Amino acid sequence: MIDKSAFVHPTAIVEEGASIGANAHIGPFCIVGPHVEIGEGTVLKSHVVVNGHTKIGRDNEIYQFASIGEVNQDLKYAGEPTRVEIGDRNRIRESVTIHRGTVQGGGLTKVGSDNLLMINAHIAHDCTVGNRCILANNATLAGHVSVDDFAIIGGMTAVHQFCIIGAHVMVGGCSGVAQDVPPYVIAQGNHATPFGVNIEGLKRRGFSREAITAIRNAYKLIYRSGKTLDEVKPEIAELAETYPEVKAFTDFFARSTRGLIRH
Amino acid sequence: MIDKSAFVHPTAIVEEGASIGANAHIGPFCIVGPHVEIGEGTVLKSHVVVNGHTKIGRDNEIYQFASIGEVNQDLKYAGEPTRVEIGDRNRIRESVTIHRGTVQGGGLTKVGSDNLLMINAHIAHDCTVGNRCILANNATLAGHVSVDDFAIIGGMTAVHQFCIIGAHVMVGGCSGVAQDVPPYVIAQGNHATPFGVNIEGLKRRGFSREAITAIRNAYKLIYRSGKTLDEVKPEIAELAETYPEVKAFTDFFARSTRGLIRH
Amino acid sequence: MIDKSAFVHPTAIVEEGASIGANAHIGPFCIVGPHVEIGEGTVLKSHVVVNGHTKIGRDNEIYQFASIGEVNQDLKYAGEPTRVEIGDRNRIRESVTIHRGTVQGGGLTKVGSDNLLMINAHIAHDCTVGNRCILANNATLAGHVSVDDFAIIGGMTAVHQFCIIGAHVMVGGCSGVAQDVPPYVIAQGNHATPFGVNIEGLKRRGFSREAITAIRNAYKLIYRSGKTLDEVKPEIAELAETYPEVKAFTDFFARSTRGLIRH
Ligand SMILES: CCCCCCCCCCC[C@@H](O)CC(=O)O[C@H]1[C@H](O)[C@@H](CO)O[C@H](OP(=O)(O)OP(=O)(O)OC[C@H]2O[C@@H](n3ccc(=O)[nH]c3=O)[C@H](O)[C@@H]2O)[C@@H]1NC(C)=O
Ligand SMILES: CCCCCCCCCCC[C@@H](O)CC(=O)O[C@H]1[C@H](O)[C@@H](CO)O[C@H](OP(=O)(O)OP(=O)(O)OC[C@H]2O[C@@H](n3ccc(=O)[nH]c3=O)[C@H](O)[C@@H]2O)[C@@H]1NC(C)=O
Ligand SMILES: CCCCCCCCCCC[C@@H](O)CC(=O)O[C@H]1[C@H](O)[C@@H](CO)O[C@H](OP(=O)(O)OP(=O)(O)OC[C@H]2O[C@@H](n3ccc(=O)[nH]c3=O)[C@H](O)[C@@H]2O)[C@@H]1NC(C)=O
Ligand SMILES: COc1cccc(Cl)c1C[C@@H]1COCCN1C(=O)c1cc(-c2cc(C)c(N)cn2)n[nH]1
Ligand SMILES: COc1cccc(Cl)c1C[C@@H]1COCCN1C(=O)c1cc(-c2cc(C)c(N)cn2)n[nH]1
Ligand SMILES: COc1cccc(Cl)c1C[C@@H]1COCCN1C(=O)c1cc(-c2cc(C)c(N)cn2)n[nH]1
């Protein structure tokens, strides 16, 4: 059902079954499939394709030539009715592609809220993007990639399948990420390696001087002490008993499946 | 002529002269020029531009914002009526560009069958793509590039003009290819260098243990023996007298014009 | 006002207020905003979006899925009425994006004349592109970048914010430019470093043997003499008293704010 306060341009094609919220705006030459939900205040500028089982939240801005909900590029996918979920207040720029999940991968591609996805960013099947993230121009996620809250990924950078980009990470431009990046780390290169703690991001986001120091000490345990990860995990858990921000490392280790980026 | 069983969306523009086969589907806001042939069962999802002297085979799927047959980017091109040929059962994803040939280059851009061309892949004027190939997101071919059967090219990778990507090659992501890549080789880096034989691809595609060993021995002749290519060519031809798969090297050497990628 | 000799396709949307010059051509499914000026002979092929306060000159060719004048990607931008200016005889290929300026950056994104902007090139807010430039596929400028006359930027290359690409520069493909590139230099790598003088470009563009030698001597002063830039600046000014082409270095030094690319 199309809310009476929504605008649908006469040249747009909204298929019966689509749900369009109050004060949404569907611009010229858009296509919206029958299983799409578009939340209140969301704008599709023009020439946008949204299809599949796809739920989009409120106050998003989706620009021309973006493709949301489309068939993914996994050769294992065979047309099953998988899903895309997108949250609120995202800016989804020209030519961005966000593909539906695969049965094998859990069936869901998810994007949170307040993200900036720049021109031609790619979010593959079964990815999970959190909140307040930035993907710069042409940043490309392979299938099953996680991008955690506040992480930023620079222009022209690609991330290999299943990798985790931890919270508050900064991945430089022109990089290739082949393994998991722990929270709070700067990564860059091809393949990307660690380059210290994203101190400036943490400072701007309200982290205390004590928390940043504890995070830097956790980084040194991982990358400078010379100990194995298994030896380091209890020491990081010990540090998190005083500095709760360090618990992000613990939670990340439990999810990591590709090993950490290394020098 | 438009076959009576083809579907042409009321908002699509199919110019008189275009040939549309049985059970083809031209989606909304597509444009199909007067010299285009579209084979049986081929689907243009929406917002596709196909123009020029362009013949497309059967059962292809061409996604939104793709541009097929368009004027190429060679400054030497001046509007001559050159051609594009595309075979069967290709999946041509969002924003892919396939440009027409140049008179100087032979007049033809050719793509075979069963290929996967991912988001924003680029096939320049006078390229030749074989069968069962994959170009990952943003993979970019300069003019006159050959991509032989079963070769795969990773995300964000670019190939310099006139290079040959041999059969069953794997080119890693985030690479720049500046010379010719012999069949069966793994290449990666900027500039790309050889990294052994694509053993896993050959195994999955039915190559025998004996054939793979012979191919690996041919690789060692080229890259490990320390002999010159001219010295190695007869030894590889000798090996191909027993192992016919090795003949692919011989055929590749006759076409190569930029020298081989090297350590 | 739309000139009586301009063609506007029935499916295009040209908003009242737009100015369309003689013998211009607005193709199907284009959108042209009320503050756009399109000069005589300019062609929008199809599926082009032009909006914002945007002035486009004569005899340009703008291809499908390009976005010209759009809101930029700077988080500091808040909708102010900034501008785009584009000159004459540019070829602006599929999926190119040219974004409007920011108040903080001077309010203007500017492109000159006779440029080739290949598929998915990006010109960010407040950039300045001169005349006779080439941006190859996926070449990406961050905000505030200058690309001076005759410079060429290879495929997949990105330029960090505020950098200057000097006149007659050649930046290789697959590169990342993080600092300023003096006129006449070849740059490549990640990060890009200098690789001599773009002698072949200068030769083709009519530079004398004496001018090229003087330019090469200026390059050696900067990169081989071992002197500091401040020591070298007067020696280059001294050389320009005889060879006026060397004055380009002087003018570039006065604009440079990020230091020069270095070995
Ligand atoms: C420096 C890092 C650069 C990273 C660059 C990343 C660019 C990503 C672009 C976006 C892609 C995304 O939209 C889709 C995606 O990631 O899908 C894949 C899916 O996430 C995965 C897991 O579920 O499965 C698939 O990838 P795999 O590599 O695991 O697939 P595969 O085993 O079928 O191999 C794919 C092809 O490579 C061939 N191959 C594989 C291994 C090898 O050693 N040699 C070889 O030739 C193989 O024959 C086949 O043709 C999926 N692919 C395909 C083509 O099906
Ligand atoms: C690590 C590897 C990275 C690879 C990146 C590849 C990215 C490819 C993107 C797709 C491009 C494809 O669609 C079109 C294409 O490849 O066309 C060219 C055509 O395949 C070729 C042969 O037929 O001829 C042309 O390339 P060339 O390099 O041979 O052309 P040219 O000699 O005219 O030089 C082009 C520009 O570079 C300048 N130049 C050249 C050499 C030099 O040393 N310095 C210099 O400035 C020269 O002045 C001119 O402005 C063609 N170009 C142009 C712009 O006309
Ligand atoms: C090897 C080189 C690779 C180069 C790759 C270039 C790819 C360019 C793609 C085109 C982008 C272009 O269209 C827009 C652009 O360049 O805008 C920016 C604008 O030119 C700039 C100046 O005016 O200002 C902004 O860039 P800055 O980096 O200066 O912005 P910022 O300080 O707000 O930081 C942006 C994000 O990075 C985070 N950050 C910053 C620094 C740091 O150390 N850690 C960190 O996490 C910070 O929290 C924030 O979320 C602007 N960005 C944003 C996102 O607002
Ligand atoms: C550092 O800034 C980053 C880093 C990661 C993500 C994001 Cl979003 C940004 C914001 C910037 C500016 O806003 C547009 C997007 N940006 C970029 O993609 C980006 C990357 C680089 C860069 C520079 C250097 C010297 C190195 N070694 C690596 N990368 N320069 N610009
Ligand atoms: C290896 O997988 C390849 C290689 C070539 C072509 C293709 Cl099609 C693929 C399939 C994958 C997954 O399906 C989407 C497309 N893919 C990619 O582009 C790709 C490249 C890389 C990669 C990883 C490493 C560690 C290195 N050193 C280089 N490249 N990871 N993913
Ligand atoms: C050298 O040619 C350049 C360089 C800069 C800009 C432009 Cl426009 C061109 C024209 C070419 C051909 O016309 C399409 C665009 N081209 C490219 O982007 C491009 C870059 C490279 C390349 C090759 C090598 C060996 C290295 N080390 C770096 N880059 N090969 N092709």
Provide the CATH number for the domain formed by C1-196 in this structure. Answer: 2.160.10.10
Alpha carbon dihedral A233, A235, A237, A242, in 10-degree steps, equals: -160
Map residue C78 onto helix, strand or coil. coil
> Is residue A94 within 8 Å of A63, Cβ to Cβ?
yes
Q: Which of A198, A200, A202 is nearest to A187 (CA)?
A: A198
Which residue type, as a one-letter code, is found at position A128? T
> Is residue A13 within 8 Å of A28, Cβ to Cβ?
no
Which residues, at least 6 apart from B91, have a Cβ–Cβ distance to it below 8 Å? B60, B61, B115, B116, B117
How far out from the chain centre does Cα B219 lie? 23
Q: Which of C105, C194, C182, C195 is nearest to C142 (CA)?
A: C105
DSSP A108-121: EEEE-SS-EE-TT-
Q: Which two tokens mark A50?
A: 């949204």
Strands C185-189 and C192-197: antiparallel
The verdict on whether omega for the bond into residue B191 sits within 30 degrees of 0, i.e. cis, is: yes
Q: Which of B227, B251, B247 is nearest to B238 (CA)?
A: B247
Which residues, at least 6 apart from A212, have a Cβ–Cβ distance to it below 8 Å? A197, A199, A202, A203
CB atoms under 10 Å from CB of A4, counted, come to: 6
Determine phi and psi for A239, rounding to 5 degrees: -65, -35
Enumerate the residues of chain B whose CB falls inside 8 A of the CB of residue A78: none
d(CA A171, CA B130): 36
Contact of A46 with chain C, judged by CB distance below 8 Å, is answered with: yes
CB atoms under 10 Å from CB of C233, counted, come to: 17
Quote the Cα angle for C66-C67-C69, to 5°.
145
Which residues, at least 6 apart from B137, have a Cβ–Cβ distance to it below 8 Å? A73, A122, A140, A158, B118, B119, B120, B121, B155, B156
Q: What is the largest CA-CA distance in chain B?
A: 65
Enumerate the residues of chain A whose CB falls inside 8 A of the CB of residue C98: none
d(CA B59, CA B40): 6
B/e letters for B147-161, b = 16+ CB within 10 Å, e = fewer, are bbbbbbbbbbbbbbb
Question: Catalytic annotation on B160?
Answer: no
DSSP chain A: -B-TT-EE-TT-EE-TT-EE-TT-EE-TT-EE-TTEEE-TT-EE-SS-EE-SEEEE-SS-EE-TT-EEEE--S-TT--S---EEEE-SS-EE-TT-EEE---TTTTSEEEE-SS-EE-TT-EE-TT-EE-SS-EE-TT-EE-TT-EE-TT-EE-TT-EE-TT-EE-TT-EEPSS-EE-SBB-TTEEEEEBTEEEEEE-HHHHHHTT--HHHHHHHHHHHHHHHTS---HHHHHHHHHHHHTT-GGGHHHHHHHHH--S-B---
How far out from the chain centre does Cα B111 lie? 6
Percentages of chain B per state (helix, strand, coil), in multiples of 5: 15, 30, 55
CB atoms under 10 Å from CB of A163, counted, come to: 23
Which residues, at least 6 apart from C28, have a Cβ–Cβ distance to it below 8 Å? B13, B29, B31, C9, C11, C12, C46, C47
> Is residue B172 within 8 Å of B157, Cβ to Cβ?
yes
d(CA C24, CA C21): 6
Q: Which helix (DSSP H) or strand (DSSP E) does residue C49 occupy? A: strand C49-50
DSSP C98-128: EE---TTTTSEEEE-SS-EE-TT-EE-TT-E
Nearest chain A CA: its distance from C65 CA (Å): 7
Judge if the beta carbon of residue A258 lies within 6 A of ligand 5. no
Map residue B237 onto helix, strand or coil. helix
d(CA C45, CA C37): 16
Radius of gyration of the CA atoms of chain C, in A = 20
| Residue matched to tokens 């896993």 | B200
> Is residue C126 within 8 Å of C101, Cβ to Cβ?
yes
d(CA B46, CA A31): 9
Distance separating the N- and C-terminal Cα atoms of chain C: 54
d(CA C118, CA C135): 6
Distance separating the N- and C-terminal Cα atoms of chain B: 54
Q: Which of C156, C169, C142 is nearest to C261 (CA)?
A: C169
> Is residue A79 within 8 Å of A61, Cβ to Cβ?
no
> Is residue B113 within 8 Å of B87, Cβ to Cβ?
yes
d(CA B46, CA C82): 33
> Is residue B126 within 8 Å of B102, Cβ to Cβ?
yes
Q: CATH classification of A197-263 is 1.20.1180.10, yes or no?
A: yes
Enumerate the residues of chain A whose CB falls inside 8 A of the CB of residue C118: none
> Is residue A148 within 8 Å of A130, Cβ to Cβ?
yes
Q: Which of A79, A146, C173 is nearest to B138 (CA)?
A: C173
d(CA B115, CA C5): 45
Contact of C155 with chain B, judged by CB distance below 8 Å, is answered with: yes
> Is residue A202 within 8 Å of A186, Cβ to Cβ?
no
Judge if the beta carbon of residue B74 lies within 6 A of ligand 2. yes
Q: Which of A250, A143, A245 is nearest to A203 (CA)?
A: A245
No. of helices (H) and no. of strands (E), chain B: 4, 28
> Is residue B98 within 8 Å of B123, Cβ to Cβ?
yes
Q: Which two tokens mark A90?
A: 């995202």
Strands B25-26 and A91-92: unpaired
B/e letters for B217-236, b = 16+ CB within 10 Å, e = fewer, are bbbebbbeeeeeeeebbeeb
**Among B46, B119, B155, beta carbon nearest to A49:** B46
d(CA C21, CA B110): 39
Ligand 6 atom at minimum distance from C173 CA: 29
d(CA B28, CA B48): 9
Q: Which two tokens mark B84?
A: 């594009």
Distance separating the N- and C-terminal Cα atoms of chain A: 54
d(CA C193, CA C162): 17
> Is residue B164 within 8 Å of B142, Cβ to Cβ?
no
Distances (CA, A) of A210 to A151, A240, A244, C95: 21, 12, 11, 47
Is B49 within 8 Å of C28 when comparing Cβ atoms? Answer: no
Report resolution (Å) to 1 decimal.
1.8
- Environment class of residue A123 by beta-carbon count within 10 Å: exposed (0-12), middle (13-18) or buried (19+)? buried
Distances (CA, A) of C104 to A119, A215, A225, C137: 22, 35, 45, 29
Which residues, at least 6 apart from C17, have a Cβ–Cβ distance to it below 8 Å? C34, C35
How far out from the chain centre does Cα B43 lie? 20
d(CA B252, CA C65): 38
Contact of C73 with chain B, judged by CB distance below 8 Å, is answered with: no
d(CA A52, CA A166): 29
Q: How far is the CA of B132 from the centre of ligand 1 (A)?
A: 14
Q: Which two tokens mark C237?
A: 């000014």
Residues making up chain A, counted from first to last: 263
The verdict on whether omega for the bond into residue A168 sits within 30 degrees of 0, i.e. cis, is: no
Q: Which two tokens mark C165?
A: 């690409």
Q: Which two tokens mark A79?
A: 């047309």
CB atoms under 10 Å from CB of A206, counted, come to: 7
Strands A158-159 and B122-123: unpaired
d(CA C209, CA C206): 9
Is A156 within 8 Å of C160 when comparing Cβ atoms? Answer: no
Residues making up chain C, counted from first to last: 263
Listed by start position, the domains of chain C span: 1-196, 197-263
Determine phi and psi for C142, rounding to 5 degrees: -70, 180
User: Which residue among A74, A88, A126, A148 is the active-site one?
Assistant: A126
d(CA B165, CA B133): 11
CB-facing half-sphere around the CA of A54: CA atoms within 13 A: 24
Which residues, at least 6 apart from B229, have a Cβ–Cβ distance to it below 8 Å? B222, B253, B260
> Is residue C151 within 8 Å of C167, Cβ to Cβ?
yes
User: Which long-range CB contacts under 8 A does B38-42 form with residues at least 24 apart?
Assistant: B39/B88, B40/B3
- Environment class of residue B58 by beta-carbon count within 10 Å: exposed (0-12), middle (13-18) or buried (19+)? middle
> Is residue C139 within 8 Å of C157, Cβ to Cβ?
yes
Distances (CA, A) of B235 to A7, A187, B220, B238, B246: 72, 46, 11, 5, 11
HEC sequence for B97-130: EEECCCCCCCCEEEECCCCEECCCCEECCCCEEC
d(CA B66, CA B9): 17
Which residue's CA is minimally distant from atom 7 of ligand 4?
A: A154
> Is residue C207 within 8 Å of C213, Cβ to Cβ?
no
Radius of gyration of the CA atoms of chain B, in A = 20
Determine phi and psi for C156, rounding to 5 degrees: 70, 15
Strands of C53-56's sheet, edge to edge? C19-20, C36-38, C53-56, C83-86, C108-111, C128-129, C146-147, C164-165
Contact of A97 with chain B, judged by CB distance below 8 Å, is answered with: yes
Which residues, at least 6 apart from A147, have a Cβ–Cβ distance to it below 8 Å? A127, A128, A129, A130, A133, A135, A141, A153, A159, A165
Q: What is the DSSP letter of B245?
A: G
Question: Catalytic annotation on C106?
Answer: no
Distances (CA, A) of C86 to C25, C79, C89, C145, C162: 17, 21, 10, 16, 20
Q: Which two tokens mark C109?
A: 């994104």
d(CA B81, CA A168): 53
Q: Which of B52, B10, B5 is nearest to B28 (CA)?
A: B10
Quote the Cα angle for A55-A58-A62, to 5°.
75
Q: Which of A210, A171, A216, A221 is nearest to A197 (CA)?
A: A216
Which residue type, as a one-letter code, is found at position B158? A
d(CA C84, CA C109): 5
